[PDB]
């Protein structure tokens, strides 16, 4: 049993989709049990996001009409450049047309009403994967192989109704997919999406097609999860930021999860958990360079001579400093802070507290800042050591980034902290926050956004290039 | 208005008590309004803690009487060696006797009942100061000046009834002391203690005689709060760990507060709060070197060339690592963690979170580990792991063989290069950093290392940043 | 300052709308300061509810089209039948046409989107009053008097945004209406709608047009609030259940409120609070029998010889019995039960608890049963040695609540005995009793099938003696 | 396997203790597996309660000394009058002396410190059973039988640390007692007490000795639990209130549990659950009339013609009326009320809600009134446009709860009518009714002064006929 997941650029044109179909069909000969997971064509999820908000805010029906045309022309072109059979192209076009009509009505409804609920937002977003998967499945059929396209819920991924990033509730993957695999059919499953218990389409979070692959692998007790992307594995850093980045042949589950979580886009952080608890290896491969060995992700852990295998960053974060009202009790005041933040579903990335004033430092997603301050005003409302006030003030610095350094044995490595932070200084970066102790393999810290490149480059020179 | 506080060693013997009385009476001829705060004689609060526990655990009444004779003879000897007047010795002796009768009555009651409530414990501990204040007062009277001994509550410190570490609710310092300063009386006030609203004696936490002084100073709008200890101010580190520790002439409120809070025993961390919010300057002085300038703590803040002015430690802490169940939401699971700990009144010193598994690192006071472990089991109900399962916490580990080291100075957080310099120094000392806190304080960086490596680490940091 | 509210049947045709405008213009000559509150025409709110559900569920645009034609034809007919002046008819028709357009757009939007939010439902429902109010207003102008139609929000009713049942947050009634009355104009204000702080149209709950009148009366410091309906005041019970029901000339504020709350449709329960707050009397009158004295509602209270002055019923309820796991602590499990139910916004009507097993009986709205069950599932999950609080839960939907009301109830000796022997003499079996928490009300639960008989028997013994 | 529990009056003197040892010794010959549970001698627990408070409030040491002499003389007399053997008397007196020594020190501690925590009370209270059990065990040994006295904790009863009314956590009975029974030993276990996990003595609540018997019975899978008291079973009401009370030969678990819970002092309410869940019969017998059949409590349930087999009362209760701020949401305001009361461990006995104002009626223990008022003010603090939940709260302590119990109560047509007309003819005025939540029980509140007359009237009507 092999699950093969392909990303947006891997299916970014018809030529590409057909290439992907050939990779799948070749694997089919080695392992007769193949499930494919597929994302939306490159950039369409982004376009779906922007048109939803345009349809909501400006409410312009010509603008929606232009989007539809672009989406139609792109997927028609894909079909024509991916499939040779007239019969198959015709049946794929029929499905794409059906989805496009459905897409159009909903977008017009949003504009008529000036209303876009999280539920409707998830539904619109689902169209990306639901437009690409019939094409890939058709292209596999065109190559003489049995195939059908399926949505994530009907493939067995059941979630709660937290539209935006629904958590997975239940898996019916074996029930839904085993009958298909037994008839020798290659199911092409939509990434990114699941289903609510009542059948409402749900998304799993941006990047979530990787997670779908792991969920389907876990559910089927798969032999391997193959992540097919546009780089040859996980690298020592984002190869788009630092050209001298190197492929890491082997990574542990925890190393990989920490890297993904702290900004390595190649893997959605939630990909690791299901594979990890069933011991299913993950292989990250390049669809544009299929002979490359990529990165194999397993339980195997080895330290490297220098301690730091990789560097990741998150840019879309803010630094929130809460000022305490003196020695008012750190556990009592944190309890109320995090109650408020939790109630509001604010995503906190990093926590530090070491202050007689009961100040606390927090990194949150930049989009969650207003929700955080909102939540904090509700909790504490609006001085003196004799009153019962816990909080004095709050400051937020949005012009900031989190940099994380990851390698086995990190926490236990003597001298590594010193080496990290003197290097950070030498790049010209000024450290606003540090987190160490809660991870076996990770050190994270905050610097000014402007210094991100110089800092990553210097860390890369010191630890990877030597 | 000047308030002078004297520590246990400063009043460690009758001779020492008189020397202290002399210091005060020399100040009364510079400032007419002098209020004294005094601690129990050296080592007696500890003795009281230990006899309390013994009266509860072994319940031997002959063993109580052995302690009563020790306290009697120590305070009698002190009266003898502090005061020259026979009338005053007789006067002070009666007060001491009356306190000893009450002490014995309660230690026996605890042995009879077999129960020691925080209320009873707070009463027992208050005897340290209620025995020393009349002796010092008597010594001041002996040097020809008016003086009476007072307890914290009747000096105007009102608290809640959280016996052990009562928080100050309310101040009546001016109401209580003004009529006495007005008549030229030097009140000798018991540090460490205050009163519940219905009159029950309460303690303010260990080391809280420094805090009493600040509360009185605040209550009086005092011109200066003088802390008289057994070192010539606040030093670059503990002079007993590092003999080459240097006196720091000047310190800002926030620097001293962070130092005290992270292990500088010279000041109880709560001392700064009331002084700072009225701008009352704190002078830390040596009773055994009264000519020394000491340390002056004010709003004045000045960066040191080598950022890092002082180094402090806490030994009596434990490192608790909470292992999360995966990506389960840090704020939500932090909310539940800190609720449980807050409910149990667990003292958390340091927090660090940076983990895809929702792990969190915690430093707590060492004696709160059982409370914390208890609180978390109630909160989370101990199973798993499954990503489909709704559990939040996978496991918990504690390491009590740990210490926290803190490094303090005006430009700390804003200073480029300092963290790397600190942590390379820490490694050069042989230590393995288990936790780091940076960001939440302007002047402080704290980290956790193995307890065995404490001295060497402090030595290396003091070498690199202070000595040169 | 007189506020006059007219119901759906009272403005249930063009002819009736003109008769109403004739009552209003007659009042204007006694009180120069008159404000009209008007409901949607009879049955249109109901039709609006069903077309919303239809637009969401099947999503047929042609069925929406058929509805727009019904709502247009209905209201065009009314304009032609209420107003003489051709100019005013054309004036009122343009207002109606603008509303229909807005209505059509939302209903198409709902069908295209496949989602009907509470915000969208409230907007759709509001069209009823927003269509009927300019027809009444135009008819008032057709009788020679100055008038304009306003919405509840623009007339000063500001609410939170709990769409469907929004709570009144703030009033600007005096501020917006006083200038209109200063010029001699008669405002015709829409009944069950308010506005959010940002101008979103909100509804006040079914029946809420009576509540608007009380709200407008309160804000204006009115001298009287007049409720015009199709019965001559509050009766000893529903005259549709019992032909021989009697008009009650006078009722106290608390008596009226308990009756309404426990099912006397003539008044929305929330009508009483604003009135009672400022001691503004409420007069309930029959538009079809205008010379009847009807019912005067004030602070005046007086016991009947036979305590028990009225009987009310609620049919659309369920009896929920929660089975405790033994002596597990009543206030603690009660805490978790009502937390869960509060969280799910479940409407509980009645609570009884008196059980060594920590059992508890609840009456809830029949439409709240699924929510309620779901909440208790989420809350409780799933020996005397484990910590389980709940054993099981049962629901009986084939149930009704009957309430008896009159001054002196709780304090009158023997009345509980007389009530329940009567109930028994009707053939009914009592499933739950509430007594103690009201000075003026006793409530109890029986099988739905015994409703009419029990009401009749109660009316026999206590009213017709 | 038989558990035999004897109450305070049953062991209220030395002659009585010896008579009890004879009943146990007779049973021993029919069933070799006998465990005895015993209470403190009559009135001793109350004496311990009063001298505790005196030691706290007045702190007179010679007054404690007078108590010690009273306790010593009583128990020395019981020893002399119960046991013939000098050697056993000597051996029991030595045990009694250790306890009295310990008891005297504790009470002197209380006066010295001027403090009495719940932990200390339980410890002091436990001395009653720890003083009588050695005497009874001595008397059993005096009659040629092997016997040892044991405390509840060491017999296998482990509780949480809720001193005063600790909940049973864990039972270890088989483990501790089975080895004793196998050697022919009759364990005499102190009723009323358990042990915290770390060894602290805990009480199970007043009346708790009955509960101990059921716990021990459940723990051993006993064939029967014998509750030996000073009446011949459970009666139709308290025979001390109504001399014409009749013994009820047979009761179901639920009938006996509801009655106990609602005031039938003969059984602690928690007695029934452990027996019920293992189907162990409870036989209630008279130690002064051992030949009477008593009352047998099992699963068997039978309706009586008059439905109402028994009337119980609770006197030490208060009626709390919480006044709501209006139509503010009952589930939501109920949520906050029961949270506050649950947090303060307030024992609520009865609940009724049925009010348009969100009023709620509550019956709580009379001792808990201040707890409840303090918690309510902590929850809510001190216009309809205001998000207020609670207007006010009044308490009435001059109140009692009356409960009527019998199989088929809830499903019986006409019974409520009959009950409440009877209440009226007693001259009582009903302040609260609870019905619905129990299959076998109807409860209501009246003025405390009307209690005797109400019970008598109910008894006349339903029992005597
Ligand atoms: N440490 C890293 N190693 C490798 N690639 C990285 C790393 N960090 C960031 N990246 C970037 O991650 C990209 C792959 O992620 P992504 O753009 O999501 O492709 P995908 O997952 O195949 N497509 P989709 O399924 O539509 O999200 C690469 O193009 C890299 O630029
Ligand atoms: N940074 C520091 N500077 C100076 N002294 C320090 C520092 N850190 C720790 N110490 C120690 O703290 C001691 C003073 O504290 P302590 O003995 O409690 O003072 P005290 O207030 O005079 N006595 P008491 O009032 O009974 O607590 C000194 O003797 C030092 O050994
Ligand atoms: N005790 C009662 N007294 C009088 N009428 C009652 C009573 N109980 C129920 N009703 C019914 O209540 C009806 C009046 O309310 P109803 O007509 O439904 O509201 P309305 O205010 O007149 N119109 P609308 O504004 O659209 O609600 C009467 O037709 C009666 O059938
Ligand atoms: N319905 C009832 N039937 C029988 N007795 C009742 C009833 N209601 C109350 N009682 C009283 O309950 C008393 C028995 O309980 P109680 O006085 O606790 O005896 P005990 O349990 O044997 N002694 P102790 O173990 O010290 O509590 C009887 O004397 C009756 O007066
Ligand atoms: N297509 C989705 C899911 C994914 O790319 O993994 C997104 O743009 O986020
Ligand atoms: N409170 C006194 C006594 C003590 O804590 O030991 C002090 O400041 O030291
Ligand atoms: N027309 C609205 C308002 C009312 O009837 O009072 C409704 O049907 O509920
Ligand atoms: N002796 C205890 C226990 C009992 O009587 O059952 C009491 O007085 O309550
Ligand atoms: Mg991706
Ligand atoms: Mg000190
Ligand atoms: Mg109506
Ligand atoms: Mg009893």
Swiss-Prot record, chain B:
InterPro entries, alphabetized: AceGlu_kinase-like_sf, ACT-like_dom_sf, ACT_Aspartokinase, ACT_dom, AK-LysC-like, Asp/Glu/Uridylate_kinase, Asp_kin_monofn, Asp_kinase
Catalytic activity: L-aspartate + ATP = 4-phospho-L-aspartate + ADP
Nucleotide-binding recorded as keyword: yes
EC number: 2.7.2.4
Residue span(s) of domain ACT: 322-390, 407-468
Catalytic class of the enzyme: transferase
GO molecular function, one term: ATP binding
GO process terms (BP): homoserine biosynthetic process; lysine biosynthetic process via diaminopimelate; threonine biosynthetic process
Entry superkingdom: Archaea
SUPFAM superfamilies referenced in this protein's UniProt entry, alphabetically: ACT-like (SSF55021), Carbamate kinase-like (SSF53633)
Keyword ATP-binding: yes
PROSITE patterns associated with the record: ACT, ASPARTOKINASE
A single cellular component GO annotation: cytosol
Pathway(s) this gene product operates in, as recorded in its UniProt entry: Amino-acid biosynthesis; L-lysine biosynthesis via DAP pathway; (S)-tetrahydrodipicolinate from L-aspartate: step 1/4; Amino-acid biosynthesis; L-methionine biosynthesis via de novo pathway; L-homoserine from L-aspartate: step 1/3; Amino-acid biosynthesis; L-threonine biosynthesis; L-threonine from L-aspartate: step 1/5
Gene3D superfamilies in alphabetical order: 3.30.70.260, Acetylglutamate kinase-like, VC0802-like
Similarity section: Belongs to the aspartokinase family.
Protein name: Probable aspartokinase
Source organism per UniProt: Methanocaldococcus jannaschii (strain ATCC 43067 / DSM 2661 / JAL-1 / JCM 10045 / NBRC 100440)
Curated annotation (Swiss-Prot), chains C, D:
Keyword Transferase applies: yes
Pathway field: Amino-acid biosynthesis; L-lysine biosynthesis via DAP pathway; (S)-tetrahydrodipicolinate from L-aspartate: step 1/4; Amino-acid biosynthesis; L-methionine biosynthesis via de novo pathway; L-homoserine from L-aspartate: step 1/3; Amino-acid biosynthesis; L-threonine biosynthesis; L-threonine from L-aspartate: step 1/5
Keyword set includes NAD: no
CDD domains in alphabetical order: AAK_AK-LysC-like, ACT_AK-like_2, ACT_AKi-HSDH-ThrA-like_1
GO molecular function, one term: ATP binding
UniProt xrefs under InterPro entries: AceGlu_kinase-like_sf, ACT-like_dom_sf, ACT_Aspartokinase, ACT_dom, AK-LysC-like, Asp/Glu/Uridylate_kinase, Asp_kin_monofn, Asp_kinase
GO cellular component: cytosol
EC number(s) given by UniProt: 2.7.2.4
GO BP, sorted A to Z: homoserine biosynthetic process; lysine biosynthetic process via diaminopimelate; threonine biosynthetic process
Superkingdom to which the source organism belongs: Archaea
Keywords: Amino-acid biosynthesis, ATP-binding, Kinase, Nucleotide-binding, Repeat, Threonine biosynthesis, Transferase
Top-level class of the enzyme under EC nomenclature: transferase
Catalytic activity: L-aspartate + ATP = 4-phospho-L-aspartate + ADP
All residue ranges annotated as the ACT domain in the record: 322-387, 404-465
Family of the protein in this entry: Belongs to the aspartokinase family.
The protein's name in its UniProt record: Probable aspartokinase
Species annotation: Methanocaldococcus jannaschii (strain ATCC 43067 / DSM 2661 / JAL-1 / JCM 10045 / NBRC 100440)
Lineage: Archaea, Methanobacteriati, Methanobacteriota, Methanomada group, Methanococci
């Amino acid at each position: 049993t092999t699950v093969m997941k392909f990303g947006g650029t891997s299916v970014g044109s018809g030529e590409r989709i057909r290439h992907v179909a050939k990779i799948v069909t070749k694997r089919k000969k080695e392992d007769d049990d193949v499930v494919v997971v597929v994302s939306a064509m490159s950039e369409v999820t982004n376009a779906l996001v922007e048109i939803s908000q345009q349809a909501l805010d400006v409410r312009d029906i010509a603008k929606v009409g232009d989007f539809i045309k672009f989406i139609r022309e792109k997927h028609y072109k894909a079909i024509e450049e991916a499939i040779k059979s007239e019969e198959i192209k015709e049946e794929v076009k029929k499905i794409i047309d059906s989805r496009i009509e459905e897409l159009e009505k909903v977008l017009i409804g949003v504009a008529y009403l000036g209303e876009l609920t999280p539920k409707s937002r998830d539904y619109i977003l689902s169209f990306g994967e639901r437009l690409s998967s019939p094409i890939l499945s058709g292209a596999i059929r065109d190559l003489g192989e049995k195939s059908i396209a399926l949505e994530g819920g009907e493939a067995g991924i059941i979630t709660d109704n937290n539209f935006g990033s629904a958590r997975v509730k239940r898996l019916e993957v074996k029930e839904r997919l085993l009958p298909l695999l037994k008839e020798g059919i290659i199911p092409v499953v939509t990434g990114f999406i699941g289903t609510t218990e009542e059948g409402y389409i749900t998304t799993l979070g941006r990047g979530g097609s990787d997670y779908s692959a792991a969920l389907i692998g876990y559910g089927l007790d798969a032999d391997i999860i193959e992540i097919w992307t546009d780089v040859s594995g996980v690298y020592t850093t984002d190869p788009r930021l630092v050209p001298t980045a190197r492929r890491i042949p082997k990574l542990s589950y925890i190393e990989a999860m920490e890297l993904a979580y702290f900004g390595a886009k190649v893997l959605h952080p939630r990909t690791i958990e299901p594979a990890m608890e069933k011991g299913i290896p993950i292989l990250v491969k390049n669809t544009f360079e299929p002979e490359s060995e990529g990165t194999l992700i397993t339980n195997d852990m080895e330290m490297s001579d220098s301690i730091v295998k990789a560097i990741s960053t998150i840019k879309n974060v803010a630094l929130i400093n809460i000022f305490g009202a003196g020695m008012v009790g750190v556990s009592g005041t944190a309890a109320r802070i995090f109650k408020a933040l939790g109630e509001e579903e604010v995503n906190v990335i990093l926590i530090s507290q070491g202050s007689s004033e009961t100040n606390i430092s927090l990194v949150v997603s930049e989009e969650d800042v207003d929700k955080a301050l909102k939540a904090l005003k509700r909790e504490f409302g609006d001085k003196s050591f004799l009153n019962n006030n816990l909080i004095r003030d709050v400051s937020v610095d949005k012009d900031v980034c989190v940099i994380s350094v990851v390698g086995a044995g990190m926490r236990g490595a003597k001298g590594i902290a010193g080496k990290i932070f003197t290097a950070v200084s030498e790049s010209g970066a000024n450290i606003k926050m540090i987190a160490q102790g809660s991870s076996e393999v990770n050190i994270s810290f905050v610097i000014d956004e402007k210094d991100l490149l110089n800092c990553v480059r210097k860390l890369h020179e010191k630890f990877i290039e030597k």
